């Protein structure tokens, strides 16, 4: 019942830049005021596009998500990760667990890319603590219940890193199970099933993904055992093997290799028909663009000289810093058609002045004309 | 002799969720009652679909197996695996075997995917202890006979992990040859030969598979030798080489890298014609869907605080848990045509109320209409 026309309008920001610490935001010792934000490639970027009113409805028929920074691979770690021993090729039986057996460990992350486009905020599933208490006593240290929660993805929320889509804040209390950038955050993963079931297609009418991972190391935990191994599955040892080793094993992910041929960005899209009833209409003059790109998550270290009066090198004369450069450039093609979210943090992008019908003057317009 | 019609009906569960320990089920010290089931990506999932009666016969012309959880790689191990020494790059001759020389070892598993669809339960071949005793005395510790057994695959049965399709329960008595999740189970592998020979095609009219593996390490055993090496094949040594090392070598598998491009799921199928006489007819108003997916077998560890009165970290204050999240969403397209299994454990799925002819309101229906 929506009538299409041959009127098109190109739009875009032409630049969107962000900078900050990749692990945690900076702030004063006890104050909650941020001095330097947290910016990394593991965070969703939800751009809430505020279109101009066509009556003073649009239809997003094309999009291009420019990325400018060089390809690179980020590194994340934890000074006090929980890692008892490596069991991939153990040659002697583990001897002691001790009071504290945490190690400074680093690791890359599951490479992942995605680009969700729709007229409604995206939906993300994770594994949080369950509600049902019923008539069961929560004994000291029992296993928390698990529940499949559904939320709305905001800018700044972390992505799945191969450790699983879970709410590490509550499910993990020791804060040593995963690297620093997610030890107290929520690693959501899009609920593609629900967002395509919805018959209208409002949550999205286009999406892409390309993620990969491999196990680079095999590690073990060190906490007290919960569900112990049944006596049936093994024969009791003696001597050195008298004390069992922990059977809680976790992998260290790795994204392998980054390439230009495996890039979904800097490439136009054509949303001629959606996978839902709605065919790209922008109800309410709004859009949401969620993008993840761990393929350019290179952290550039900075070194600053405290004093320049030293003839020889000294570690106590230089300060080490980490910062991450995030660059974006959104381009859109819109087609003319004739016929409550303030709780969340989005990256507002205003386009009410950046509309022009001179398609040929812009690259995306040239591509659209060619196709 | 079966007449086809232009009547179609979409159906689906819209959600199927499971949770539990990935290695072994939980239960009371000596009671056989389960508190937490065993759920992992190494288990077959046989969904026994109970269709409504068309007379109050269907023909499954399409299927889609949705998977929601993020890609990941599971890790399995054994606190007391039998592993004498690594022989890939040995630089000094092995010295001692000792009374017990088992080590805490971990390893990933052969990546494997499959999806069998048919009107009869699937068939699986393994390598079990043979029947024939005849006139041969079973001397103490002799080699058990081997036989190619055929069974029916049930939900909860393990898959081939690169250690071979065999009944580890009987063939291996020490319970230290393979990881904990299969040391007392049956790792079956589908008998594609027999299931396609059957002239009717009832056992299946569609199947897919994509499995891969590589040797990540080379290991040796430590038990007493059985069939000893012939004296012809080597020259007797002396000194350090006086005592031969075991010649029983086993590999540690590895599935390499998981990718979205290598996914057979979340993709529709069209069973226009089967490989057998039967062309997808659902005799008895039933179906079986066996699926394996080790590409999303990430185990999310949980940590719970016993006490919160400690200033410093202590391993004796946190309990470690392992759980696995299994998510499924089956969609089917059925076509109208006009013209004893209660011993096993299946995952019953009722569809007698979830039939609707509004194809466009569902994604699979939109895809079917497009094609």
């Amino acid at each position, epitope marked *: 019942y929506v009538a299409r026309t041959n009127i098109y309008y190109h739009a875009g920001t032409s630049r969107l830049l962000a900078v900050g610490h990749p692990y945690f935001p900076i702030k004063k010792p006890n104050n909650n005021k941020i001095l330097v934000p947290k910016v990394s490639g593991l965070q969703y970027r939800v751009f809430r596009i505020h279109l101009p009113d066509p009556n003073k409805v649009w239809a997003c028929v094309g999009v291009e998500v420019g990325r400018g920074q060089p390809l690179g691979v980020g590194i994340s770690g934890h000074p006090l990760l929980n890692k008892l021993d490596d069991t991939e090729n153990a040659s002697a039986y583990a001897a002691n667990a001790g009071v504290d057996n945490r190690e400074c460990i680093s690791m890359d992350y599951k490479q992942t890319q995605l680009c969700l486009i729709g007229c409604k905020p995206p939906i993300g599933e994770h594994w949080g603590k369950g509600s049902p208490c019923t008539n069961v006593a929560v*004994n000291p240290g029992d296993c928390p219940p698990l529940e499949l929660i559904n939320t709305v993805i905001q800018d700044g929320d972390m992505v799945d890193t191969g450790f699983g889509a879970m709410d590490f804040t509550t499910l993990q209390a020791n804060k040593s199970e995963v690297p620093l950038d997610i030890c107290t955050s929520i690693c959501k993963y899009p609920d593609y099933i629900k967002m395509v079931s919805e018959p209208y297609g409002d949550s999205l009418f286009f999406y892409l993904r390309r993620e990969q991972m491999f196990v680079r190391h095999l590690f073990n935990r060190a906490g007290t055992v919960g569900e*112990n191994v049944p006596d049936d599955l093994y024969i009791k040892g003696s001597g050195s*093997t*008298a004390n*069992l080793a922990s059977s809680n094993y976790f992998p260290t992910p790795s994204g392998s290799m980054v390439t230009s041929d495996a890039q979904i960005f800097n490439k136009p899209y054509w949303l001629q028909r959606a996978q839902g009833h709605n065919n790209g209409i922008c109800w309410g003059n709004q859009l949401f663009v969620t993008v993840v790109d761990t393929t350019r998550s290179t952290n550039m270290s900075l070194c600053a000289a405290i004093s320049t009066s030293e003839t020889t090198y000294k570690n106590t004369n230089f300060k080490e810093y980490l910062r991450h450069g995030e660059e974006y450039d959104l381009q859109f093609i819109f087609q003319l058609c004739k016929i409550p979210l303030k709780k969340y943090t989005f990256w507002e992008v205003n386009l009410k002045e950046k509309f022009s019908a001179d398609l040929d003057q812009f690259p995306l317009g040239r591509k659209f004309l060619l196709q | 002799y079966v007449a086809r019609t232009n009547i179609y009906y979409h159906a689906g569960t819209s959600r199927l969720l499971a949770v539990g320990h990935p290695y072994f089920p939980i239960k009371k010290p000596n009671n056989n009652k389960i508190l937490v089931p065993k759920v992992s990506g190494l288990q077959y999932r046989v969904f026994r679909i109970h269709l409504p009666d068309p007379n109050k016969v269907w023909a499954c012309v399409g299927v889609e197996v949705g998977r929601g959880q993020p890609l990941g790689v599971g890790i399995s191990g054994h606190p007391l695996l039998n592993k004498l020494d690594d022989t890939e790059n040995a630089s000094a001759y092995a010295a001692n075997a000792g009374v017990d020389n088992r080590e805490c070892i971990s390893m990933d598993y052969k990546q494997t995917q499959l999806c069998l669809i048919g009107c009869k339960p699937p068939i699986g071949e393994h390598w079990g202890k043979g029947s024939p005793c005849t006139n041969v005395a079973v001397n103490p510790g002799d080699c058990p006979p081997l036989e190619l057994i055929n069974t029916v695959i049930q939900d909860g049965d393990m898959v081939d992990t690169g250690f071979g399709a065999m009944d580890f329960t009987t063939l291996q008595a020490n319970k230290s040859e393979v990881p904990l999740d299969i040391c007392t189970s049956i790792c079956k592998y589908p008998d594609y030969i027999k299931m396609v020979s059957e002239p009717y095609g009832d056992s299946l009219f569609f199947y897919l598979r994509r499995e891969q593996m590589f040797v990540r390490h080379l290991f040796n055993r430590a038990g007493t030798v059985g069939e000893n090496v012939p004296d012809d094949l080597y020259i007797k040594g002396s000194g350090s080489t006086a005592n031969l090392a075991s010649s029983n070598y086993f590999p540690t598998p590895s599935g390499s890298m998981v990718t979205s491009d290598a996914q057979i799921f979340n993709k529709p199928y069209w069973l226009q014609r089967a490989q057998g006489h039967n062309n997808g007819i659902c005799w008895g108003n039933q179906l079986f869907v066996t699926v394996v997916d080790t590409t999303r077998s990430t185990n999310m560890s949980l940590c719970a605080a016993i*006490s919160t*009165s400690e200033t410093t970290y202590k391993n004796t204050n946190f*309990k470690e848990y392992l759980r696995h999240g299994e998510e499924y969403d089956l969609q089917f397209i059925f076509q109208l045509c006009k013209i004893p299994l209660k011993k096993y454990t299946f995952w019953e799925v009722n569809l007698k109320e979830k039939f609707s002819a509004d194809l466009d309101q569902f994604p699979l229906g939109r895809k079917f209409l497009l094609q």
Partner: antibody
Amino acid sequence: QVTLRESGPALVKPTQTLTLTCTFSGFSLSTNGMCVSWIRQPPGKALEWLALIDWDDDKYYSTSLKTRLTISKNTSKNQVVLTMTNMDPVDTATYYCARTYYNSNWSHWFDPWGQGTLVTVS
Amino acid sequence: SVLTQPPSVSGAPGQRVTISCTGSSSNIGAGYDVHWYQQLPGTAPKLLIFTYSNRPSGVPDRFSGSKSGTSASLAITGLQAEDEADYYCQSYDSSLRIWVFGGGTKLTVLG
């Protein structure tokens, strides 16, 4: 708060049947994770576990004395009854009733303890 | 008592004395938790620790413990007359398939 009280005969003749009853308040044997166990301590000797019953009514007994022991519970009356048969002078010991938490592990602990009722066999 | 404890240990006031509870591959080595109880002369046992170190309400922080393989230890800091009790360790044994206690140790102070 949660409390336990023991009651029963202080003197029982040999080869007879002893019966003991406990009364607990502040919790019920219907809540998951709640259990009750019986322990004994002969004079100048270490503690010895005897039996245990849980919310699902599953019962556990010491292997050395399994045949002689039986236990039961009454949720509506918050009482649990122990019965030992074929008594012997060696069994003269103090018996404590204690609440017990269920772990995902199998190593349960008994946080509260009763006063302890002494039993003599002669 | 399958679990073994020293019969008795003596310590000076204010000194850090320690206790040991040796086990085997069936009770402690298998991973089953360990718990402690203190029993004053003429009183019932009282819970002290319930997973190798944890402290219930009403116990001073000077009580702790750790896992050292097929053994567990109880550490007391600032020895006083309150610590003149008998201490017992407890755990689960898969072979005997029962819950077991130790031989108990009589802590004394050289006052």
